[PDB]
Amino acid sequence: YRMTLGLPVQAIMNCADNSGAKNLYIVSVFGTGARLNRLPAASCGDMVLATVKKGKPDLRKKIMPAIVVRQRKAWRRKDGVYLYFEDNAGVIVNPKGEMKGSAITGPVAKECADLWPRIASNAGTVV
Amino acid sequence: AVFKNITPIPDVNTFLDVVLSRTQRKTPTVIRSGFKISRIRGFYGRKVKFTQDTITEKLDSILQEFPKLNDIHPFHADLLNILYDRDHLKIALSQLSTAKHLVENVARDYIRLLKYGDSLYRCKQLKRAALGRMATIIKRQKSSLEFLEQVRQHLSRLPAIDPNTRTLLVCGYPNVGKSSFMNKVTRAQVDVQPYAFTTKSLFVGHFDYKYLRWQVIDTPGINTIEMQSITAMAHLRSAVLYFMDLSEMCGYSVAAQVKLYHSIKPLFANKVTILVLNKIDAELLQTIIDDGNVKVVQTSCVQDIGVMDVRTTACEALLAARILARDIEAANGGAGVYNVELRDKYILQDPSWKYDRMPELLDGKNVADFVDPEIEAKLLALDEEEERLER
Amino acid sequence: HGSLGFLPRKRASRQRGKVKAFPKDDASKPVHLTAFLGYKAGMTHIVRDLDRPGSKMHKREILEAVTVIETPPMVVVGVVGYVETPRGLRSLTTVWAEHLSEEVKRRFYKNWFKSKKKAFTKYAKKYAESTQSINRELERIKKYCSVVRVLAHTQIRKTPLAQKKAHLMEIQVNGGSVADKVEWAREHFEKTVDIKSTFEQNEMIDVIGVTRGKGNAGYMHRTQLNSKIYRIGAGDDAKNASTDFDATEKRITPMGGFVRYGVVENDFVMLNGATPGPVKRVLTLRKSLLTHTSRKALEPVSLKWIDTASKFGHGRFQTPAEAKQFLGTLKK
Amino acid sequence: ALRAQFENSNEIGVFSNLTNSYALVALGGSENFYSVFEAELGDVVPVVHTTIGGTRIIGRLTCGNRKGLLVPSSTTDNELQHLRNSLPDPVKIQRVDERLSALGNIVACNDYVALVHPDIERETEEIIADVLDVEVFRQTVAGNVLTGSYCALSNQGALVHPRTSIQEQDELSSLLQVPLVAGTINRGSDVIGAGLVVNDWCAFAGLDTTATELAVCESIFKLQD
Amino acid sequence: TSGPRDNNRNKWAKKHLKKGKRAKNSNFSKFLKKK
Amino acid sequence: PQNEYIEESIRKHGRRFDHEERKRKKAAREAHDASLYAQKTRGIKAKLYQEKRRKEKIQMKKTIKQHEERNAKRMITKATFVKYERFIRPMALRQKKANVTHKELGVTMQLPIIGVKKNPQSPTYTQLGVLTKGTVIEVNVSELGKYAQITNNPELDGCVNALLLT
Amino acid sequence: MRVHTCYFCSGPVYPGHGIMFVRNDSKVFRFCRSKCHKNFKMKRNPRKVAWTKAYRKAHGKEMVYDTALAVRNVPVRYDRNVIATTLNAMKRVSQVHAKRERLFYKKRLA
Amino acid sequence: HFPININLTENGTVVEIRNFLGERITRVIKCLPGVTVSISSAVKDEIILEGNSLENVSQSAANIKQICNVRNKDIRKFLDGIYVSERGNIE
RNA sequence: AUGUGGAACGGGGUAUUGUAAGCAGCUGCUGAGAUUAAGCCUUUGUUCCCAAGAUUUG
RNA sequence: GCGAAACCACAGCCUGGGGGGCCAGGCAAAAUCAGCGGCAGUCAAGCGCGACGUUGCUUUCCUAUCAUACCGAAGCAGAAUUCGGUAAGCGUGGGAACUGAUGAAGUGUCGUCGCAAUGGUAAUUCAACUUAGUACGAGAGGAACCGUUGAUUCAGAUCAUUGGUAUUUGCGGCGCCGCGGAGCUAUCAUCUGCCGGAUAACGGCUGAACGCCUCUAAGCCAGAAUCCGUGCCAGAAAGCGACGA
């Protein structure tokens, strides 16, 4: 169930949730193997840690769980049809898996939809 | 202690055996005579430095696993003090870290001594000195570990307390038949015999009453078992369940139990009691009934009747105070290997066309995109239209 | 350089994939074959439903990357017989059939068109004079044999190639008695034993070959294992490529011919993944060694739709038929 | 009343859907969950285990009522053909094209009225009025357009978000013309519609559903009888 | 998991190969041997 | 887990069907198991097992004797006590207290060194007051001034274990 | 599989090859060709690209319409004979499409 | 709680055992050559095995004792299992 | 070292670009033109070629 | 085509032992080319001390496993944890001519076919579904087997789908730009990676020494990520066979 891995750590992605944050500096990737000559990355559907760069001051300088929604990288789907979204956007979640934003804005991958059901109900325009 | 999850306390020499074995396994056990003097100094030094760290590892593991008796609840700490001489246990804990601090200083003294190593055999004597002298410190603390393991056996045997939630304390005559009602109430059932102090240990039994958890808290009948029952009843947000043998089938007089109830009336204060007249089917009671807060219930312990009604009254008083498809899949191919067939699960007319496959697309066009219900009549009109267009 | 099982890295000897091991069989089984010979047409892709319970796409539609292999009907021309010795496995008698084509007679020769073409002349004479001499050697086969293998060479005329020498291979017959195998061999001499009687479209193949020379990496023989057959097509039938879900008749040969191969007219096997060697290198099929119980083989296979676009370039059409109605009328 | 989990978690309302006339069970899961609905209402209504767009989000992606069930645009026609085979002729099947595919997570439907998102398309609202034949109300459930996510709907009751105002709850209950319960499912979770399933004759709750919350749901939906 | 020479992954497989694939293979080569 | 709330419950639940036959056979097998455990064992772990075995043999022999009786650069690299100071003595190497064991009392008690009476190595060592075995050192005897001879080599040992000269 | 269309080249979209990109407005555009993918990247008009069908469409160079044979978000029940006639309906429709477009090509060339 | 299934096959040679602590593992206990085992009918949960060669008979039941051998659990609480009590002659 | 043989072209398919020159009043010719094996395919089309010298070994 | 020079006891295989040569071994076929604990005291085994005891303070290799496999023991219900054992195979505590490519020659010569002495090896861990909210457990927690599906690393191949190069000096536009086939490239893309015995600890059965007993003494079973064979890689260029003329 793997996707394309091209989003390395220490990157700025859009906090597309309704939590009020705008930008987030990527921090960590969960469950990533020790791979040399290739940074530990994630795609739309992986739980990651990031520190909010822009947005609320309480959210800023505070790392929390997050999952990628919009995939700027060519996420080669299992259906074969590749998809190139606008940019790299995501939504912050709790360590248990509760999305911080009460609403969702932007696109979220269907491959990411089945993994996280808490963030699935927060979105209505799943595309 | 309730959530102890502490490691067992082994023999000190056995603890020293594995620790020395850790020095025999983790440290480099070979030291060449041709190596550098400082390198040889660190061979016995860093091993001893790890040995003291190993000595500090299990000791701090024992220290962290040792809980604070003052941090325990008033009913938990007093019963623990009544269990295995917690004052002497804390003194051993006081003798544990201080000796560990003494072990820390002796190792630091030897480390500074090892910093000025001169000869190989002198360091070899020094390497023997710091290990064995600290082993003598382990040998000095001989009986300290003996009391911890039994306490570790006691704390593991000691269950969790449910004072914060709604609970029910059952105290009175020893095995007066209300314990049988208590055994019929909760999932955990305590065994009783005709002997005295049979229900010496408290029973942690989970139960619910009227959509509210009712914890049956067992207390020994009134020593050591009753003193623990006194300490548990001292600090508890629960009600009393005084079972009085009306027919003296519990071996105790009603006047002796009521006077004891009058004696235990200070501990029974600030709580709605239950004057369970046990052994109904088997004067001084009016003086006990003068309190008013005791729920006088006639309990036929011989006939085993009246427990649920008392459970309904006391809990309210406590509330007043407060084949299948999977079966088909089990026979077809098991879980994760059997496939479900949806051809039979169809409302189509022709069953032969139901199990048959359906052409999704043809000639570069989606066959379903141009498929309508009246397409057969439309195609017949299409064949006539093309014939008319040709004519 | 960590897979020392494949070190040392030196090039292979035989351009044709040499079979080393042969599957364990019984005398209770009926007589059947193990090996075969095919050619590397090229890689393609398909779509197919997935009747695999317990997977994340159970009863879904998933692309699969595949490989069509050009497989002609296969000409058996005789047998060899092995006796078992403390020194290994020696071959006792080699008995051929009476007649050979020029293609397999090109195999024995280096310059067939220059030379006198006189191979197998006098052996055909003793075939006509005395078949009881052949009986004598066959009498020595059913008396003293343990492993029977039959000869074989490819119908390379049907394959559109400039190579005219046939490729000769053994196939070990498996099943039945030793006398049954010689009975099966002498009743199939000089004919062709076709591919559709070997496999059942649900069996897996461990295809072998020599990998692609890289202009000393490459040209090193491999035995790739565990590739699944999806369709043993019939070259005479024009419905080979067209599945039941895309009834409209179409051919497996893509437009503009295959890249580096060209056109395909004969039976093919539709094996997934890949195999060693470049396009139109000789290729070998064989049976599995252990009866493998993965559900990837125990499942049925029923295709959905095949892509036959122009691999030369980047085509966007299935057949030149449907292209013209999708396009307008050209200036032609 | 049923208290179980959709294999993975207790949020069973997101995995599978259920209408008043048929039940849309998902595919790819274990047969126990399908047998759970089969033993519950299989003898009454149909329960078809089928995937929606090759995914397991049938509960929150499509909306359905006693009249019919409408699904997103990207639904597979073969799945629709499977749906048209599984669902009866009286069960209307119609695909809806919109920029928001989650009909179940953003729109709530009942046997008499419907709760629609304030940002829903007019053609989508008219088609929903044509198919489901219920009084659609394009509004925001507790300020959220995800009406199906923030609230649950049933025939003999309704479940509203606990964060909504009581005056707004009384306004929404009057708009729905049915009793609404401003509570939470799965013992205080944020999933209301996906945290509890309720039909006209049965109801389903999660494995993590509270005993009091389930009792609040059965009283609101009149499921005690 | 298990290893190459792991009997745990091989003892259950021999019982798993008694049913499943073996009879289907016998059903496969029967029609293959048919002319 | 054990005797409290398990054992009596196990009494009502029963034990293993062969809980006694397994122990006795293992008990009888131990009489022959100790020989191979003494024979096939090798290395330091065997000597450790032999250390307890030699202790057990000694422990049993004493018990057998009792039962029979019952039946009847210019630097100072050595430890010091604290131009003329040509060498260098470290602060950590300097020792001020010593475990002084009285000859008559036998009380090994840590006491401070009042001074260094005489070092048997060299007068310069006596001038430097280095710590060594057999040296005469002044020690305060008020809490017991007295002299003492070092009975242990504090260089290789690291501690000044000295016996009172009186 | 319902085949999509090229967003720029206006041709059909088949399985395997190509790419399907979605916009921020939930507008999924599928380009069947890499040049068409580059055309959508370069944002050139489909009717202003001679190599695209929209240019011939909005210039009179392509056939406008052909309502031959007198012929879907609603699912319906399946029938063997209904689909059989639907299978035969596409053959005559394609034949009429070949004849009508040829006459349209005869008018366009003249 | 979970009764252990036992099925005698091949004249009692192939012992099909299952449901040991409700486990789905198919326990096949092939008897030694020359010994016949059968489920005793007088006493429930009793298997009577008889034969001429006692060594092959005794090792087979010990193998049966090693077949459903308990592991990865406390032997005290988990106490029900397969045991051998009667060992005697056929006459 | 004479064949459904080969070489050089031509034809066709296939694709890459992008509607050719030029004509008339941006449009129609013009989804045209060009290119496509040099490690694309095909060829009943045209022309040409072929009856081989030397060496090694029995 | 012209054409040195340095240098030159004679030289050229490895292991061990007293270096190239010696001793004992492994072996050994031409001819060439490209990379390269102490002190004090009390005892007392025994021969004045005296043991165990008692009293005073202070790249690769190697297992000695850091996880994975398997078990043993423990207040080990379960989970989780501790100790011990096998175990260095693979992962995550220490040590430090070689590989390619031609090549004559016994087999009368050439060619096809397999044979196999030997040389190397391979897979790896992680988690998801039931099987379970079950057994168990007051509750809270929560088994294990089989079956199934995944993910990571490594290895092996593969260039349809996606990407990069233009000496296709190929197509077009204004030396510049758009495209750029093929070929090439890629966890940038894609497919595959297995099994049969024998064993360590350990658990056993039978059964003497020693009339009992005893997993042992002769036998015997089960039993490890363990080893050896299957399979996989190559084929002695002085190993060999059948057939073709």
Swiss-Prot record, chain B:
Keyword line: GTP-binding, Nucleotide-binding, Nucleus, Phosphoprotein, Ribosome biogenesis
Any one Gene Ontology molecular-function term assigned to this protein's record: GTPase activity
Domain OBG-type G: 166-319
Cellular compartments per GO CC: mitotic spindle; nucleolus; preribosome
Disulfide bonds: none
Biological process annotations from GO: assembly of large subunit precursor of preribosome; ribosomal large subunit biogenesis; ribosomal subunit export from nucleus
Coiled-coil stretches noted in the UniProt entry, renumbered to this chain: none
Binding site for GTP: 172-179, 218-222, 278-281
Compartments where found: Nucleus, Nucleolus
Annotated family: Belongs to the TRAFAC class OBG-HflX-like GTPase superfamily. OBG GTPase family. NOG subfamily.
Function, in words: Involved in the biogenesis of the 60S ribosomal subunit.
Protein name: Probable nucleolar GTP-binding protein 1
Organism of provenance: Schizosaccharomyces pombe (strain 972 / ATCC 24843)
Gene behind the chain: nog1
Residue window of the full protein shown: 4 to 465 of 642
UniProtKB/Swiss-Prot annotation, chain C:
Keyword Phosphoprotein tagged: yes
Chain intervals with Basic residues compositional bias: 8-21
Lineage: superkingdom: Eukaryota
Signal sequence region: none
Span list, region Disordered: 1-24
Localization per record: Cytoplasm
Gene Ontology biological process terms, A to Z: cytoplasmic translation; translation
Annotated keywords: Cytoplasm, Phosphoprotein, Ribonucleoprotein, Ribosomal protein
Broad class of the protein's primary localization: cytoplasm
Presence of keyword Cell division: no
A GO term for molecular function: RNA binding
Gene3D superfamilies documented for this protein: 3.30.1430.10, Ribosomal protein L3, domain 3 (4.10.960.10), Translation factors (2.40.30.10)
Membrane-spanning segments: none
Pfam families hit by this protein: Ribosomal_L3
InterPro entries from the UniProt entry: L3_arc_euk, Ribosomal_L3_dom_3_arc_sf, Ribosomal_uL3, Ribosomal_uL3_CS, Transl_B-barrel_sf
Modified residues (Phosphoserine): S3, S55, S130, S133, S197, S242, S302
Modification Phosphothreonine, positions: T319
Subunit annotation: Component of the large ribosomal subunit (LSU). Mature yeast ribosomes consist of a small (40S) and a large (60S) subunit. The 40S small subunit contains 1 molecule of ribosomal RNA (18S rRNA) and at least 33 different proteins. The large 60S subunit contains 3 rRNA molecules (25S, 5.8S and 5S rRNA) and at least 46 different proteins. uL3 forms together with ES39L one of the contact sites for the signal recognition particle that targets ribosomes to the endoplasmic reticulum membrane.
Annotated family: Belongs to the universal ribosomal protein uL3 family.
PANTHER family: 60S RIBOSOMAL PROTEIN L3-RELATED, LARGE RIBOSOMAL SUBUNIT PROTEIN UL3
Miscellaneous comment in the UniProt entry for this protein: There are 2 genes for uL3 in S.pombe.
Protein name: Large ribosomal subunit protein uL3A
Origin species: Schizosaccharomyces pombe (strain 972 / ATCC 24843)
Lineage of origin: Eukaryota, Fungi, Dikarya, Ascomycota, Taphrinomycotina
Gene coding for it: rpl301
Swiss-Prot record, chain D:
SUPFAM superfamilies recorded: Pentein
Residue(s) carrying Phosphoserine: S173, S174
Predominant subcellular localization, coarse grouping: cytoplasm
Superkingdom classification of source: Eukaryota
PANTHER family: TRANSLATION INITIATION FACTOR 6
Name of the protein this chain belongs to: Eukaryotic translation initiation factor 6
Pfam families xref list: eIF-6 (PF01912)
Keyword Iron-sulfur: no
SMART domains: eIF6
Subunit structure and binding partners: Monomer. Associates with the 60S ribosomal subunit.
Location within or outside the cell: Cytoplasm; Nucleus, Nucleolus
GO BP annotations, alphabetical order: assembly of large subunit precursor of preribosome; cytosolic ribosome assembly; maturation of 5.8S rRNA; maturation of LSU-rRNA; ribosomal subunit export from nucleus
Keyword Ligase: no
Family: Belongs to the eIF-6 family.
Biological role stated in the UniProt entry: Binds to the 60S ribosomal subunit and prevents its association with the 40S ribosomal subunit to form the 80S initiation complex in the cytoplasm. Is also involved in ribosome biogenesis. Associates with pre-60S subunits in the nucleus and is involved in its nuclear export.
A Gene Ontology molecular function term of the record: ribosomal large subunit binding
GO CC annotation terms, alphabetical: cytosol; nucleolus; nucleus; preribosome
Classification via NCBIfam families: eIF-6
UniProt PTM: Phosphorylation at Ser-173 and Ser-174 promotes nuclear export.
UniProt keywords, alphabetically: Cytoplasm, Initiation factor, Nucleus, Phosphoprotein, Protein biosynthesis, Ribosome biogenesis
Swiss-Prot record, chain G:
Cell location: Cytoplasm; Nucleus
A GO CC term assigned to this protein in UniProt: nucleus
Biological processes per GO annotation: assembly of large subunit precursor of preribosome; ribosomal large subunit biogenesis
Highest taxon in the source lineage: Eukaryota
Record bears the keyword NAD: no
The keyword Cytoplasm appears for this protein: yes
UniProt record similarity statement: Belongs to the eukaryotic ribosomal protein eL24 family.
Assembly behavior: Associated with nucleolar and cytoplasmic pre-60S particles. At the end of biogenesis it dissociates from cytoplasmic pre-60S particles and is likely to be exchanged for its ribosomal homolog, rpl24.
Protein name per its UniProtKB record: Ribosome biogenesis protein rlp24
Organism: Schizosaccharomyces pombe (strain 972 / ATCC 24843)
Gene: rlp24
